[PDB]
CSV table of C-alpha atoms and ligand atoms in Angstrom, one decimal:
chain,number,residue,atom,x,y,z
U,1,UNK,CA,106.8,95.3,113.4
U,2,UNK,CA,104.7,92.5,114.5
U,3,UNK,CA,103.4,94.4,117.5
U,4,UNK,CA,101.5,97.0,114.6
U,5,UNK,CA,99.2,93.8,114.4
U,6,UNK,CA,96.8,92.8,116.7
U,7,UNK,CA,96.1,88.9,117.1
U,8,UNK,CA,92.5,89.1,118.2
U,9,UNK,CA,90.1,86.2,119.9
U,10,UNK,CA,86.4,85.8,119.2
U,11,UNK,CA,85.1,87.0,122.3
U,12,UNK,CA,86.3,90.3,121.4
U,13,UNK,CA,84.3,91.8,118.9
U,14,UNK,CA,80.7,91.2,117.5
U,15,UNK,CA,79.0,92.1,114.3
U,16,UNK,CA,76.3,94.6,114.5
U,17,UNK,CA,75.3,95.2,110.5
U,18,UNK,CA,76.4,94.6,107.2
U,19,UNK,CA,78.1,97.4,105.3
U,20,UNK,CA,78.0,95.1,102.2
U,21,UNK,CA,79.1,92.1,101.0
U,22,UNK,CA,80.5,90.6,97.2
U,23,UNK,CA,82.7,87.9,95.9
U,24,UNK,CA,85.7,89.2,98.7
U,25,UNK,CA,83.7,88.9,101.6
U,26,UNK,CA,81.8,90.5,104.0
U,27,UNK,CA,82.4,93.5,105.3
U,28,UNK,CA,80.7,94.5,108.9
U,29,UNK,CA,80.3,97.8,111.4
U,30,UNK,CA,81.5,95.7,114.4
U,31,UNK,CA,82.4,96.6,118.1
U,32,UNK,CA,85.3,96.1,119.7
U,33,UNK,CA,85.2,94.1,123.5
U,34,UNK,CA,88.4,94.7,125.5
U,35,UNK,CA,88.7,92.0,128.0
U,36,UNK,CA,88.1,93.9,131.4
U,37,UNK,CA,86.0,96.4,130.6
U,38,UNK,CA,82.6,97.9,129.8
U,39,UNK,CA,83.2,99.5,127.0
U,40,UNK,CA,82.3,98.9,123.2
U,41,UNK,CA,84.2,100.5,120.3
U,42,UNK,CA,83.1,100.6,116.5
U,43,UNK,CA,85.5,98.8,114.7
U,44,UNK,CA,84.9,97.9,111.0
U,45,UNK,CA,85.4,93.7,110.0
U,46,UNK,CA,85.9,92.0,106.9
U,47,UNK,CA,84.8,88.0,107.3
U,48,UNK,CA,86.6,86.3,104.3
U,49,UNK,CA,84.7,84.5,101.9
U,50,UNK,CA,86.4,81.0,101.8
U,51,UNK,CA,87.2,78.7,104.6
U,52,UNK,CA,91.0,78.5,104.6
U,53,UNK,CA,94.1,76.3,105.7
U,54,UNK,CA,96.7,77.1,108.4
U,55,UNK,CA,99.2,77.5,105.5
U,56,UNK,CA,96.9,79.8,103.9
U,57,UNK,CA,96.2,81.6,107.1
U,58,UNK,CA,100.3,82.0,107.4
U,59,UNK,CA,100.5,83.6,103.9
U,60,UNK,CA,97.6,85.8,105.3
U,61,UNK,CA,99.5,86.8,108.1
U,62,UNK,CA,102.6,87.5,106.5
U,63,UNK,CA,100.8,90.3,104.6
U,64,UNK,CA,98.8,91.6,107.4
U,65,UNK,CA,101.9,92.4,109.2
U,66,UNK,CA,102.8,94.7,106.1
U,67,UNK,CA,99.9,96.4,106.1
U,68,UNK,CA,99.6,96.9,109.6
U,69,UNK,CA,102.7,98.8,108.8
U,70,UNK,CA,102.0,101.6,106.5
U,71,UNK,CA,101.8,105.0,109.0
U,72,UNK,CA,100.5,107.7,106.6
U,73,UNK,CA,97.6,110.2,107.2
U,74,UNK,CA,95.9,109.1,104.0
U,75,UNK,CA,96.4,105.6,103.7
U,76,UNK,CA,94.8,103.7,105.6
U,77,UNK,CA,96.4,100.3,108.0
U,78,UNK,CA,95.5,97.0,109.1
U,79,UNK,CA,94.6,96.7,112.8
U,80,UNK,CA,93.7,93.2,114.1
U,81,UNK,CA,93.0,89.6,112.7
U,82,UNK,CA,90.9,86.7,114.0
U,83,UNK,CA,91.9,83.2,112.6
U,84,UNK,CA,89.2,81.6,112.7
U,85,UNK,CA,87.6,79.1,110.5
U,86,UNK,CA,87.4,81.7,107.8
U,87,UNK,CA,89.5,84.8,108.7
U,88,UNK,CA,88.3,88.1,110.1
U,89,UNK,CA,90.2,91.2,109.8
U,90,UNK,CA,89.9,94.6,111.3
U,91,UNK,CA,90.3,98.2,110.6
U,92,UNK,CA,89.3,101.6,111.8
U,93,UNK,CA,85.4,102.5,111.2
U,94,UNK,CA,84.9,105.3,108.9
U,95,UNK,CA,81.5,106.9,109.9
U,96,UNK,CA,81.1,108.9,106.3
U,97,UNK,CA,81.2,105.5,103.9
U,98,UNK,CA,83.3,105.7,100.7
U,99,UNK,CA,84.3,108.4,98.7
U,100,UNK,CA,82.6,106.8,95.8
U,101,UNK,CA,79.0,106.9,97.9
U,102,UNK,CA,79.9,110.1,99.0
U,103,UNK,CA,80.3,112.1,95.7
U,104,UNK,CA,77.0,110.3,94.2
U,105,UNK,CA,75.1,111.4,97.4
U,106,UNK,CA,76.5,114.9,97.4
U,107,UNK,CA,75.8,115.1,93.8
U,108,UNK,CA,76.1,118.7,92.3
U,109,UNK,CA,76.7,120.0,95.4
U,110,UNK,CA,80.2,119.5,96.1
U,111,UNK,CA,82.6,122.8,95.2
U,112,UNK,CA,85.8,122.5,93.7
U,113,UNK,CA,87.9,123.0,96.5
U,114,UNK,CA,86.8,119.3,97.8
U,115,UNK,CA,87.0,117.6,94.5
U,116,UNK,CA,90.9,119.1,93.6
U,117,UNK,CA,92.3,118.6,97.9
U,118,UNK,CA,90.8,114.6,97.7
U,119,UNK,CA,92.7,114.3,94.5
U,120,UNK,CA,96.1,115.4,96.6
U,121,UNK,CA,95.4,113.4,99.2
U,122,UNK,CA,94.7,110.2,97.1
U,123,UNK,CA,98.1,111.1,94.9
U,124,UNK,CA,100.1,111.6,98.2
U,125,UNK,CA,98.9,108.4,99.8
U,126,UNK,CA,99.7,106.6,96.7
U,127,UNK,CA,103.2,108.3,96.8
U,128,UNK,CA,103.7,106.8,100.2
U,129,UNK,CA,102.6,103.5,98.7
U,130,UNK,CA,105.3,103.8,96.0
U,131,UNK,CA,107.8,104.7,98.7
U,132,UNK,CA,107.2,101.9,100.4
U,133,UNK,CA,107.0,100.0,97.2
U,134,UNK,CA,103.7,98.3,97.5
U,135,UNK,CA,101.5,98.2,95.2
U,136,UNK,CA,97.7,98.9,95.4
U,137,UNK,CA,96.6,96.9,92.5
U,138,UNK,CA,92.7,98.6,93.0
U,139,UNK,CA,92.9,101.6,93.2
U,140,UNK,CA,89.0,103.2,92.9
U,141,UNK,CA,86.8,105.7,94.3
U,142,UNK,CA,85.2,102.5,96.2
U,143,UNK,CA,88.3,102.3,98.0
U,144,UNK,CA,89.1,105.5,99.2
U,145,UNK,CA,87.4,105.6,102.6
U,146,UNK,CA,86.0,109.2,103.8
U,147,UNK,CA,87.2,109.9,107.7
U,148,UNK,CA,86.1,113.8,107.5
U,149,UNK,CA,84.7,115.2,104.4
U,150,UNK,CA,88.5,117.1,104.7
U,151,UNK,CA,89.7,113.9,105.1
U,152,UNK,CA,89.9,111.0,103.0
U,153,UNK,CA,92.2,107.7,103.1
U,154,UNK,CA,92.9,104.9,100.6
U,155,UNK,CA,92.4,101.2,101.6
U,156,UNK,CA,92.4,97.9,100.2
U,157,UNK,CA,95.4,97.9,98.6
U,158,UNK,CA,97.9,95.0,98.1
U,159,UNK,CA,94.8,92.7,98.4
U,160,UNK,CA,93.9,91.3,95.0
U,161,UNK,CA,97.4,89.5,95.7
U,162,UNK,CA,88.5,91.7,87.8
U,163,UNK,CA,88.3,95.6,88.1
U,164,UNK,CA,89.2,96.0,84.2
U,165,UNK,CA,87.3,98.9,83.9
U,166,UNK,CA,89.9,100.6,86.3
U,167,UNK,CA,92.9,99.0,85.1
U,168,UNK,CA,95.8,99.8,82.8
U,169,UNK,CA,96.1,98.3,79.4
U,170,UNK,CA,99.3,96.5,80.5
U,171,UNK,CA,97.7,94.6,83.2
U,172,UNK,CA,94.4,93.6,81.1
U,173,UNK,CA,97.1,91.9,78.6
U,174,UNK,CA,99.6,90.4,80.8
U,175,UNK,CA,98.3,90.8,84.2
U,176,UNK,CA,101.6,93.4,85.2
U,177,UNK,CA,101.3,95.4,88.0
U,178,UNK,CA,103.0,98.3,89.2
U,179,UNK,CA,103.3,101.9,90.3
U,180,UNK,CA,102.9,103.1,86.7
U,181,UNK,CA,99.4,101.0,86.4
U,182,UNK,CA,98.1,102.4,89.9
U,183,UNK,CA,98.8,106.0,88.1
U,184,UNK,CA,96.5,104.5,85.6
U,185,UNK,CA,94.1,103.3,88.0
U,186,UNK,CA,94.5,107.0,89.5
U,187,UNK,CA,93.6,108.5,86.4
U,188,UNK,CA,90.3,106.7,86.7
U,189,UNK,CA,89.4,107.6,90.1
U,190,UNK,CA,90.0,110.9,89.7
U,191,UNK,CA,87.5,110.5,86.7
U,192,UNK,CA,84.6,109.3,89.2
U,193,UNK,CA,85.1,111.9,91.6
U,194,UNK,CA,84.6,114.5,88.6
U,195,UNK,CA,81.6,112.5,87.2
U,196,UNK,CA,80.3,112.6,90.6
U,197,UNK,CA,80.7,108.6,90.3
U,198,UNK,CA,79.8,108.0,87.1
U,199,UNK,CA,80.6,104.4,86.4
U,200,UNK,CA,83.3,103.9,83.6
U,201,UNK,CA,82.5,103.0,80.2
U,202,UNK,CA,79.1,102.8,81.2
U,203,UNK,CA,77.4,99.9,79.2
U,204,UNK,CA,80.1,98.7,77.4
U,205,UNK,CA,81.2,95.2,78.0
U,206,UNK,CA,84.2,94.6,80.1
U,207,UNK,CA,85.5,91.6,77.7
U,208,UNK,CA,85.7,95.1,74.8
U,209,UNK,CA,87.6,97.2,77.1
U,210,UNK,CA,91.3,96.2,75.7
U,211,UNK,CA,90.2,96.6,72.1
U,212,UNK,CA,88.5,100.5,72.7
U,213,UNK,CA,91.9,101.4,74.3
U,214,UNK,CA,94.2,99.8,71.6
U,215,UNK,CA,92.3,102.4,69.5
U,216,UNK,CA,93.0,105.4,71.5
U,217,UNK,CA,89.7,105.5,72.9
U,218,UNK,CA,89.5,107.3,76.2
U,219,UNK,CA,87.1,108.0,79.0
U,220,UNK,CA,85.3,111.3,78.0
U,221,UNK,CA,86.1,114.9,79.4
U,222,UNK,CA,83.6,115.3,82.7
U,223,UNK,CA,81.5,119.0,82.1
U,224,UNK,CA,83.1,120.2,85.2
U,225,UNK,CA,86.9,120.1,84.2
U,226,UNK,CA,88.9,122.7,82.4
U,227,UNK,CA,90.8,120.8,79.3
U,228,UNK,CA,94.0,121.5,82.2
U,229,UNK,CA,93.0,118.8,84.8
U,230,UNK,CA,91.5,116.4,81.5
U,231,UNK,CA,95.0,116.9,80.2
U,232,UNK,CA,96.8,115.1,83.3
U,233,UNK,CA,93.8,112.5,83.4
U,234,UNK,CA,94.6,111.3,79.9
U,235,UNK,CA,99.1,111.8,80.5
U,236,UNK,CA,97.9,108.8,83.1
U,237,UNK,CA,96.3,106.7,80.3
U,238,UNK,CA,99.3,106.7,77.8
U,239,UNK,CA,100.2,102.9,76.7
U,240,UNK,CA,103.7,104.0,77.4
U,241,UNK,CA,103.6,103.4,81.3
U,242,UNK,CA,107.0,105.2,81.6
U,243,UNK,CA,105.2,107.9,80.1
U,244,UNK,CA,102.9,108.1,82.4
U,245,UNK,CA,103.1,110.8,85.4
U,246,UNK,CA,104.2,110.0,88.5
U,247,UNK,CA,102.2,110.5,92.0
U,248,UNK,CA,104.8,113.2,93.6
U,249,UNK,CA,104.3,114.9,89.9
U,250,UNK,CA,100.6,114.9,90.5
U,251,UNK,CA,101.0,116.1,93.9
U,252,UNK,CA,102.2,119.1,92.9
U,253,UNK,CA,100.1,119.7,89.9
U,254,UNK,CA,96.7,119.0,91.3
U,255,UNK,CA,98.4,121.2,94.7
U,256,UNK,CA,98.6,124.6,92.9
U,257,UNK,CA,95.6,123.8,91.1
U,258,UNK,CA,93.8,122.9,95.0
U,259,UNK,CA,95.0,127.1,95.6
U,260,UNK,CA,93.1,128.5,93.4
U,261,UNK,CA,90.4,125.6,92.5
U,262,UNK,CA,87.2,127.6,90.6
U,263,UNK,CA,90.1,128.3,87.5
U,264,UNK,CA,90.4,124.6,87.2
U,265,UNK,CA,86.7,123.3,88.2
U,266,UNK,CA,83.5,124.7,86.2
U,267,UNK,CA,80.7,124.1,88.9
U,268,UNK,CA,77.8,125.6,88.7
U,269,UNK,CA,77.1,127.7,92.0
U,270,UNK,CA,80.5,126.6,93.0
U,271,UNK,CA,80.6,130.2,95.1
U,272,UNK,CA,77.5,129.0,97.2
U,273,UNK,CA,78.7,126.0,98.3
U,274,UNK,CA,80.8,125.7,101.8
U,275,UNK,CA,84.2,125.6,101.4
U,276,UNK,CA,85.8,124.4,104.9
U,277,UNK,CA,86.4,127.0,107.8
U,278,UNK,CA,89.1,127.0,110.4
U,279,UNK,CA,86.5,126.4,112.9
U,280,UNK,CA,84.9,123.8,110.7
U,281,UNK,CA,88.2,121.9,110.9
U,282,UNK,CA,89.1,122.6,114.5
U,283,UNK,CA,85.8,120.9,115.5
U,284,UNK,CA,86.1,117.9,112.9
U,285,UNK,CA,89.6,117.2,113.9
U,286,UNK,CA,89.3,117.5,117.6
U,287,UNK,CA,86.0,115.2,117.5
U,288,UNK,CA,87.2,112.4,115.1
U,289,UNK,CA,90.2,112.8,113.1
U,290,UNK,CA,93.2,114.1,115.9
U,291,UNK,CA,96.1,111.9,113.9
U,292,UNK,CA,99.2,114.1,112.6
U,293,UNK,CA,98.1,115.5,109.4
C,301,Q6K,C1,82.2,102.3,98.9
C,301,Q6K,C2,81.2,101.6,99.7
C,301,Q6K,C3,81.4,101.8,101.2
C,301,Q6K,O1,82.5,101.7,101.7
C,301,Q6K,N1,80.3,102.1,102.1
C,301,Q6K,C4,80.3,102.4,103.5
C,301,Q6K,C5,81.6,102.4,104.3
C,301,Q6K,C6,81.7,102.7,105.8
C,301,Q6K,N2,82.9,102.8,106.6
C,301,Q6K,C7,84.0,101.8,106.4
C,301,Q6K,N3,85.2,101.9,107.4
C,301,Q6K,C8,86.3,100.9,107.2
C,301,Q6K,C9,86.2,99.9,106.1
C,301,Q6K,C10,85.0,99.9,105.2
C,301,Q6K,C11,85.0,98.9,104.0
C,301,Q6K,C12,86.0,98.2,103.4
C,301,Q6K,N4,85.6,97.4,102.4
C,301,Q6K,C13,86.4,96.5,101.6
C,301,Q6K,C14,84.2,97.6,102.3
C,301,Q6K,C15,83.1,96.9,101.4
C,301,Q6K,C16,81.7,97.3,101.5
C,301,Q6K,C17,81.3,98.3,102.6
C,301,Q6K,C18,82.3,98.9,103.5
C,301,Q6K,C19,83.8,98.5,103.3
C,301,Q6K,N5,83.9,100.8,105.3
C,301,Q6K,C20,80.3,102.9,106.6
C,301,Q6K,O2,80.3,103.1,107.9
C,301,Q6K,C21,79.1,103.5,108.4
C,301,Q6K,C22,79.0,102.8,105.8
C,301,Q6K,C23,79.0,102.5,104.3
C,301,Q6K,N6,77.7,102.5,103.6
C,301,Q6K,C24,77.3,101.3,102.8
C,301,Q6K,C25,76.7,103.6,103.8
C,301,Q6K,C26,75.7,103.6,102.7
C,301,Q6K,N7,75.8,104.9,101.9
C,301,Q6K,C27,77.1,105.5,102.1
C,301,Q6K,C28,75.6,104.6,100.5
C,302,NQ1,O1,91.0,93.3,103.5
C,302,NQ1,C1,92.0,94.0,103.7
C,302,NQ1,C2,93.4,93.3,103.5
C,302,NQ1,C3,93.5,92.0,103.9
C,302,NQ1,C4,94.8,91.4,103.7
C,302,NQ1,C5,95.9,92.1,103.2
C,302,NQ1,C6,95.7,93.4,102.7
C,302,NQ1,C7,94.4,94.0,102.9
C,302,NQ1,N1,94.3,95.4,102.5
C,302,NQ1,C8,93.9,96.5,103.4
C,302,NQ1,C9,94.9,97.5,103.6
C,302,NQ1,C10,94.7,98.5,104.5
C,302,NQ1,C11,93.5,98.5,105.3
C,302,NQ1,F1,93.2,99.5,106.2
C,302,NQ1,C12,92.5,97.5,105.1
C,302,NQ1,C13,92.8,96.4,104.2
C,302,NQ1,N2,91.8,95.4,104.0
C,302,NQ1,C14,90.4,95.8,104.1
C,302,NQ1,C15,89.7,95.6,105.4
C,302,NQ1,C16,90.4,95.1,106.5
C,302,NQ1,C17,89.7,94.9,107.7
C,302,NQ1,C18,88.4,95.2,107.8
C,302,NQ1,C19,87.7,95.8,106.7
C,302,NQ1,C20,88.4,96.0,105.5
C-alpha cells in the first residue's frame, strides 16, 4: 500500500541528538513538524551514510513501501522517508533503547518471566516475517527495540539487502539467506538476552568463526538456563538448516516454558524481582503502547 509510507519534506522534522551512529548511518531522536500546527512529536531518524542517485533512491523506495507494510505487534514498520541528498528515514521512537542495552543495564536483576515472554515475542514477530516471506538477514539483541519493558519489537530487518558472529554457517560460506539462518541468528539472540548481553565468542576473531563451527564448537550454556532452553538454543545451530526449528515451533516451546518460567530459568533472587501486574500493564499500555496486542 503506498499510502503505509509517508513521503516527507525537510521542513518537517529536525534532529535533536544522536542515538548513535556506525558504518549504516546515523541514527537520531528527531521531532516531527506537521505543517499547520504547534506541535512537535518524537520521531526516531536514520540519515544514510552515502550520498545516493535517483536510481538508487528508487530501489530505496521500492523497499520502504514493503516495510512500511508489515502490521504486527512485535515487529516493528517503516513510517516516512526524506529524499534528500542522502536519504532520511523514519520510524516510531522507542523511549526504553534496545533490548541489547536494556538487559546489560538491568544486569542480574531481570526475572525469568521477562527473559522467556521477550523470547516469544521475538519468535512470533519473526513468524510473521516468515509469513510474509521476508527475510531479516540481522537478527540481534541490537535490533530488537524495547517499547515497554512488556513489550519488545524487532527492526531492521531486510536492510543488509558483516554480523558473522550472529550468522549461520551457511551464509558465512556462501552468503545464503533465509528463514532457517534467521532461526540461527535467533538462537544467538536468545543467547545475549540469557548472558545478560554477553558478546558472542568474546575475543575470538571473526575471520575464525567458520572454522570453530565446522568443528562442532558452540556458544557455551549461559549459568541461568536449565540444559531444556540450551537444548532448543543449540537444535537452532545444527549445520542441517532443515534441521533446524522453526519460529511457530519455538513459539510454542518457549510459550509453555513463559507459564511456568523459574522451572526453566535459574536466577538467583528470581522471587524478589517484579514480575508485571495487571495494573502495571493497564498503566504502561494506556500511556504508551495502546496498539492491538
Ligand atoms: C541497541 C542500541 C539502541 O538502540 N539504543 C537506543 C535506542 C532508542 N530508541 C530507538 N527507537 C527507534 C529506532 C532506534 C534505532 C534504530 N537503529 C538502527 C539504531 C542505531 C543506534 C541507536 C538507535 C537505533 N532506536 C533510544 O531512545 C531514547 C535511546 C538509545 N540509547 C543509545 C540509550 C543509551 N542506553 C540505552 C545505553
Ligand atoms: O533503516 C531501516 C530500513 C531502511 C530501508 C529498508 C528497510 C529498513 N529496515 C527497517 C524495518 C523496519 C523498521 F521499523 C525500521 C527499519 N530501518 C531502521 C530505521 C528506519 C528509520 C529510522 C530509524 C531506523
Amino acid at each position: 500500500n503506498q499510502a503505509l509510507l509517508r513521503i516527507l519534506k525537510e521542513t518537517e522534522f529536525k534532529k535533536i541528538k544522536v542515538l548513535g551512529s556506525g558504518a549504516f548511518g546515523t541514527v537520531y531522536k528527531g521531532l516531527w513538524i506537521p505543517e499547520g500546527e504547534k506541535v512537535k512529536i518524537p520521531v526516531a531518524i536514520k540519515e544514510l551514510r552515502e550520498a545516493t542517485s535517483p536510481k538508487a533512491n528508487k530501489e530505496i523506495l521500492d523497499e520502504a513501501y514493503v516495510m512500511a507494510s508489515v502490521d504486527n505487534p512485535h515487529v516493528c514498520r517503516l513510517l516516512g522517508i526524506c529524499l534528500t541528498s542522502t536519504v532520511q528515514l523514519i520510524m516510531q521512537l522507542m523511549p526504553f533503547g534496545c533490548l541489547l542495552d536494556y538487559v546489560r543495564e538491568h544486569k542480574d536483576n531481570i526475572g525469568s518471566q521477562y527473559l522467556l515472554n521477550w523470547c516469544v515475542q521475538i519468535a512470533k514477530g519473526m513468524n510473521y516475517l516468515e509469513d510474509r516471506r521476508l527475510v531479516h538477514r540481522d537478527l540481534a539483541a541490537r535490533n530488537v527495540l524495547v517499547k515497554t519493558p512488556q513489550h519488545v519489537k524487532i527492526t531492521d530487518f531486510g536492510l543488509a539487502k558483516v554480523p558473522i558472529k550472529w550468522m549461520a554457517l551457511e551464509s558465512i560460506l556462501h552468503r545464503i539467506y533465509t528463514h532457517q539462518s534467521d532461526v540461527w541468528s535467533y538462537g544467538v539472540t536468545v543467547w545475549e538476552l540469557m548472558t545478560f548481553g554477553s558478546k558472542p565468542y568474546d575475543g575470538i576473531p571473526a575471520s575464525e568463526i567458520s572454522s570453530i563451527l565446522e568443528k562442532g564448537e558452540r556458544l557455551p550454556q549461559p549459568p541461568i538456563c536449565t540444559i531444556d532452553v540450551y537444548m532448543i538454543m543449540r537444535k537452532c545451530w545444527m549445520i542441517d538448516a532443515d534441521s533446524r526449528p522453526k519460529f511457530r515451533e519455538l513459539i510454542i516451546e518457549f510459550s509453555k516454558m513463559a507459564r511456568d518460567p523459574q522451572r526453566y530459568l535459574v536466577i538467583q533472587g528470581d522471587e524478589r524481582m517484579h514480575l508485571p501486574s495487571p495494573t502495571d500493564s493497564n498503566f504502561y499500555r494506556a500511556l504508551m503502547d495502546e496498539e492491538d496486542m
